[PDB]
């Protein structure tokens, strides 16, 4: 399932093309990533403290998961 | 200055080299060069057609290498002959073999410094023994429109060229290009060797070989009953009493000849105990 | 030329060549589609009227 | 263990016209040459091949010339045109040697596996087979001696490999596909039987000749060992082949025994069809 | 040449043949055949087949180049 470059003669499997970008994925992928602090929460204070203990601090300290020694969320 | 109906006398190892410069010519359309000697006006001969590299990239003006050029006639010289070259030869064994729109540019491109340089189409997958696609062309030229394109000096070599005339955008390319007449040389300085080793070798070798026998009559003779019942449906089939059938469906004979000599096989078969004993 | 003929046409240069009298659908497919032959009428019996 | 090739006379055609630059280059009488093609099985084939530009002194006839700018070059040429077709041997005509041959074969044997010299025919007139082939052989003796090197006979043959005939059968502008039992027998009968016997008179002037002034291969190690191979049948009077004659009552009996019933089936072909359109050619004819 | 006639039959025969269907028949051995190429053709067919063979669209045999009814 990938793009390659063949010779129309020999047919042989020539390059790789570095043009596999897949369509509305790589579209889907948000670039400009817009600016929101936590200031703009307000209510789910609580929600941002389970929030970040079960999301943000997966993606930093697996440690803080593993020294301990089950899993991450 | 003047038209003339020309002639080329081929040595034979050049199709040699065609037939292997197409037959291992993969059809990918490749270009060689032609080396054979201009001997007069009104022939030529080629007396070789040497081989090219792997140009795996295109048929083009720029595929030849002038140092294989001079290296290659210095191998002529370091051999008995350094020959001179007369033209080019291409292969186009994929399809109807006709000329190439890079023909129609390497072709004066050659033609420039040489003389004739005839072009050579090839195509051996068009058939074994019974076509025979060997194919050259003179390009005539719109510089030459001012006199008729009619040399015709010598006529009915061009009239038997022009007993085809049939290759599909050939024929519309009458324009720009007319044909030479291709004979085969009077090989027989090979052709008898050709010959003696063509029948020396390919009936039996020392011909102590065969002098299989008996089983394969016993095959064949089961054969030689197992039509017979319905090679003699045909006297039934005979049996329309007063008139009834077109065309007789003749299958009298393929079972006659092959008992013929089949069974002449079969009884100097039997003869060559006492011919090869005595 | 007749309308909606089929001709014969060289590959050569597409020149127009010769003319085919033809039919054009699937005429053999299903055009001669019948039964052919069968038997008589003595094998009805009652459906006269 | 090598049977057979098979030759193209592409390359032999080669050796004709380099046959045409012997004869006019000067006093090089034999045509010498390196056979190029590749190793597949005991069966190969050659494709290609080069003459040598090649002088031999009749004095100390052990000087060759093959010279590497004619080499080395030339087999980066036919190289480039081809990686497949490389050197196997070589050849040079005449029918028996040259006592330049050996280390000939010695030269190229750094190149190859198994450099084969195959000595060639230039213009054939033989009792016997075309162009041979012999391998690198080490039979020595049971001497115990240094080894011996000399190149022996190694069967081959003239085989066709492809297509290649819409040259060669259309020059063919003579011959006919004859269906064996339309003389093509007799013409094996001349060649077996004449081309036979006459080297059955070559075997008397080996056992005349070698009984006469032949010194140690008059019976090295093979004459007698295929005097057993003379000795299937070679007896006296008649040689009383006494099983062979009901034994040949039972050969003579299925050649008999087809030839009556079938030829008189044969008779039904040609008899019965005959007389019809016979006479309705001749009676429907007014 | 009759031997030349009949082996000339079956020489760019049987080693890559292509297959087509048969579609109608204007004349003697002579027809149209559509094929699985997805195009149809008017060829000249031989005289080798016999002609009641040809009632249906049937798998049939053709040449590549020459396309021809074997
Ligand atoms: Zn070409």
């Not at chain 4, 490389?86 to 010695?106: C, F, M, Q, S």
């Not at chain 5, 269907?21 to 559509?34: H, K, M, P, R, S």
Request: proline residues 4%.
């Amino acid at each position: 399932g990938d793009l390659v470059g063949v010779n129309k003669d020999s047919y042989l499997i020539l390059e790789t093309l570095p043009t596999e970008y897949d369509s509305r994925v790589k579209a889907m992928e948000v670039d400009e990533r817009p600016t929101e602090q936590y200031s703009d929460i307000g209510g789910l204070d609580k929600q941002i403290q389970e929030l970040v203990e079960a999301i943000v601090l997966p993606m930093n300290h697996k440690e803080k998961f593993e020294n301990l020694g089950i899993q991450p969320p | 200055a003047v038209d003339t109906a020309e002639q080329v006398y081929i040595s034979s190892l050049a199709l040699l080299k065609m037939l292997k410069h197409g037959r291992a010519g993969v059809p990918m359309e490749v270009m060689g060069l032609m080396l054979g000697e201009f001997v007069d006006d009104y022939t030529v001969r080629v007396i070789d057609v040497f081989a090219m590299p792997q140009s795996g990239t295109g048929v083009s003006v720029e595929a030849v290498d002038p140092v294989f050029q001079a290296k290659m006639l210095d191998m002529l010289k370091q051999t008995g002959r350094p020959e001179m070259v007369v033209g080019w030869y291409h292969s186009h064994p994929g399809f109807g073999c006709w000329l190439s729109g890079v023909d129609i540019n390497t072709q004066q491109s050659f033609e420039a410094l040489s003389e004739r340089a005839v072009a050579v189409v090839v195509d051996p997958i068009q058939s074994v023994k019974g076509k025979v696609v060997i194919d050259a062309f003179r390009l005539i030229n719109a510089n030459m429109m001012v006199l008729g394109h009619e040399p015709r000096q010598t006529t009915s070599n061009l009239g038997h060229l022009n007993k085809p005339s049939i290759q599909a955008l050939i024929h519309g390319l009458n324009r720009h290009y007319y044909s030479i007449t291709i004979n085969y040389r009077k090989n027989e300085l090979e052709q008898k060797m050709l010959l003696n080793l063509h029948k020396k070798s390919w009936m039996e070798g020392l011909t102590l070989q065969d002098y299989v026998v008996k089983e394969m009559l016993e095959l064949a003779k089961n054969y030689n009953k197992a039509v017979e019942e319905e090679d003699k449906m045909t006297p039934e089939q005979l049996a329309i009493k007063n008139v009834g059938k077109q065309d007789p469906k003749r299958h009298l004979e393929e079972h006659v000849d092959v008992l013929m000599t089949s069974n002449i096989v079969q009884c100097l078969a039997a003869m060559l105990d006492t011919v090869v004993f005595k | 030329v007749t309308p909606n003929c089929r001709v014969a046409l060289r590959n050569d240069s597409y020149t127009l060549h010769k003319i085919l009298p033809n039919k054009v659908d699937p005429l053999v497919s299903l055009m001669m589609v019948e039964k052919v032959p069968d038997s008589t009428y003595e094998m009805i019996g009652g459906l006269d009227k | 263990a090598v049977q057979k090739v098979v030759v193209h006379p592409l390359v032999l055609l080669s050796v004709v016209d380099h046959f045409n630059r012997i004869g006019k280059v000067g006093n090089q009488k034999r045509v010498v040459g390196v056979l190029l093609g590749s190793w597949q099985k005991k069966v190969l084939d050659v494709s290609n091949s080069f003459a040598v530009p090649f002088d031999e002194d009749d004095k100390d006839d052990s000087v060759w010339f093959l010279d590497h700018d004619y080499l080395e070059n030339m087999y980066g040429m036919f190289k480039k045109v081809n990686a497949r077709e490389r050197i196997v041997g070589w050849y040079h005509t005449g029918p028996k040697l040259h006592k330049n041959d050996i280390a000939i074969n010695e030269l190229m044997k750094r190149y190859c596996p198994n450099s084969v010299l195959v000595i060639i025919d230039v213009k054939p007139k033989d009792l016997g087979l075309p162009t041979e082939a012999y391998i690198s052989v080490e039979e020595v003796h049971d001497d115990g001696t240094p080894t011996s090197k000399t190149f022996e006979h190694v069967t081959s043959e003239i085989g066709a490999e492809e297509a290649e005939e819409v040259g060669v059968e259309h020059l063919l502008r003579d011959i006919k596909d004859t269906t064996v039992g339309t003389l093509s027998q007799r013409i094996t009968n001349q060649v077996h039987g004449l081309k036979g016997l006459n080297s059955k008179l070559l075997d008397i002037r080996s056992y005349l000749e070698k009984v006469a002034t032949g010194k140690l291969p008059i019976n090295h190690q093979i004459i007698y060992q295929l005097q057993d191979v003379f000795n299937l049948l070679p007896d006296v009077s008649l040689q009383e082949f006494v099983k062979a004659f009901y034994l040949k009552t039972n050969d003579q009996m299925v050649v008999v025994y087809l030839a009556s019933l079938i030829r008189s089936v044969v008779a039904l072909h040609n008899l019965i069809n005959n007389k019809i359109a016979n006479r309705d050619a001749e009676k429907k004819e007014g | 040449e009759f031997l030349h006639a009949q082996e000339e039959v079956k020489r760019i025969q049987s080693i890559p043949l292509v297959i087509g269907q048969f579609l109608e028949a204007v004349d003697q051995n002579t027809a149209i055949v559509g094929s699985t190429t997805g195009s149809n053709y008017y060829v000249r067919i031989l005289s080798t087949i016999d002609r009641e063979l040809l009632k249906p669209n049937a798998s049939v045999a053709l040449h590549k180049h020459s396309n021809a009814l074997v």
